[PDB]
């Protein structure tokens, strides 16, 4: 029981990098619209990776942490993959279910590894897939395990202040809800930029999202992607990832390798679900 040697930061990883030993799988072309938010995600990620010093010379306060919020399905995670593919920096895919308590001291030790790894071979991106199971708006804190989850989040706060004044991109995290968030996590200096993702978007931002998933697939000369833009007006990004996927299943009942408009409107009818924004429940015009 004495200190007989020291270990480099690189070694003793939670898990090795996925961004200079693997390459993210989704590109920025597979993102359709949210162009207003795309100007912002290259502000949030890309500019602190190539050079932090641009901000310094102006003297404007940097952005620190990236908060992605929205109702699920809107491509928060897909976007993380996107800008990591364009920038071609290091990326570390961890999750909070690899951080969760299992042994005594598991929680703090596991949080520390990823930051040590990112900083030594900086500039780097740390991704925590979600923080909805650690960070919960309320805690009972009258049981040992609820204070363990809290130990894991508290270390994350401490490592976040540590991560600042570095040319790394501060932790990426997404949340599926508005009541996962605490008034000590969204504090500026912890999460600066709050990139929106609505289920509202406008007619142009619905329009681009259909066309990209149609670029992926075969089409027929009678296929209409633009007759769906006005049917429903409360969509998310991956409810279109299902309608299109279903058109390739209805086609295989025919034994077809192009997509028909019959296939695409039959899939439209499902997966939408009850909606009151659509033009049939609307008489306020």
């Amino acid at each position: 029981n004495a200190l007989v040697d020291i270990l480099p930061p690189d070694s003793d990883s939670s898990i090795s990098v996925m961004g200079e030993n693997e390459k993210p799988d989704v590109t920025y072309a597979d993102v359709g619209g949210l162009d207003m938010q795309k100007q912002e995600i290259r502000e949030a990620v890309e500019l602190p990776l190539v050079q932090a010093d641009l901000y310094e010379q102006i003297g404007i306060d940097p952005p620190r942490g990236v908060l992605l919020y929205g109702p699920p399905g809107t491509g928060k995670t897909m976007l993380v993959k996107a800008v990591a593919n364009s920038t071609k920096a290091a990326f570390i895919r961890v999750n909070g279910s690899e951080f969760v308590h299992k042994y005594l001291g598991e929680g703090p030790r596991m949080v520390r590894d990823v930051f040590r790894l990112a900083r030594e071979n900086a500039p780097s991106i740390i991704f925590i897939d979600e923080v909805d199971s650690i960070a919960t708006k309320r805690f009972d804190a009258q049981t040992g395990s609820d204070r363990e989850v809290q130990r894991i989040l508290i270390e994350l706060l401490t490592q976040m202040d540590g991560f600042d004044q570095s040319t790394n991109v501060k932790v990426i995290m997404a949340t599926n809800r508005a009541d996962t968030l605490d008034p000590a996590l969204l504090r500026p200096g912890r999460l600066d930029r709050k990139i929106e993702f609505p289920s509202l978007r406008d007619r142009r931002e619905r329009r681009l999202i259909f066309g990209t998933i149609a670029s992926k697939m075969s089409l027929a000369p009678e296929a209409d992607l633009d007759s769906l833009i006005i049917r429903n007006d409360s969509l998310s990004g991956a409810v279109i990832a299902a309608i299109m996927q279903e058109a390739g299943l209805r086609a295989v009942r025919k034994n077809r390798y192009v997509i028909l408009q019959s296939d695409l409107e039959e899939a439209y009818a499902t997966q939408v679900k009850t909606d009151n924004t659509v033009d049939k429940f609307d008489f306020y015009k």
Binding site: D140, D182, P183, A184
Partner: protein
């Protein structure tokens, strides 16, 4: 900073604690800590968004 008080910003949170873990029992005790480390300013920021 001028008065040399401990600026204790409370926020209506259960996350600031991890050692008692409810606000009701941390009213006496918060006072007692602010007396240990006196002078102090207990900035209990109520919000009333809670629930």
């Amino acid at each position: 900073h001028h008065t040399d008080c401990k600026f204790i910003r409370v926020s209506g949170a259960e996350l600031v604690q991890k050692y008692i873990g409810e606000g009701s029992r941390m009213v006496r005790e918060l006072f007692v800590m602010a007396r240990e480390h006196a002078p102090s300013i207990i900035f209990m920021d109520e919000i009333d968004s809670i629930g």
